[PDB]
């Protein structure tokens, strides 16, 4: 029974952590998209 | 939507700046024409 419980713990923790990391990476990618959209170099063209 | 907006910005800024530069060059060419018309070397012929 301890082995059954431990395997359940291992599987759930591993998969949950992996998916959490993947979604966090997706979120940070989206945040980088937002930064790039905000990060517009209009100043240089205006100076030219 | 951000990409659509950004492409619109890029196209409009590029074309407007290019045409502005071209027309400024035309204007300076015309100003050089006016200078050449004013810049008459009558003094040298008068001295001869």
From Swiss-Prot, chains A, B:
SS bonds (residue pairs): none
The annotated consequence of gene deletion is: Essential, it cannot be completely disrupted. Cells with very low levels of protein have no ordered thylakoids, are barely green and are non-photosynthetic.
Where it sits in the cell: the answer is: Cell inner membrane
The role this protein plays is:
Required for thylakoid formation.
Q: Which family does it belong to?
A: Belongs to the PspA/Vipp/IM30 family.
Put simply, this protein is called Membrane-associated protein Vipp1
Section of the entire sequence shown: 120 to 167 of 267
């Amino acid at each position: 029974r301890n082995l059954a419980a431990l395997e359940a713990k291992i599987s759930e923790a591993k998969t949950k952590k992996n998916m959490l990391q993947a979604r966090a990476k997706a979120a940070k990618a989206n945040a980088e998209l937002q930064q790039t959209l905000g990060g517009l170099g209009t100043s240089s063209a205006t100076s030219a």
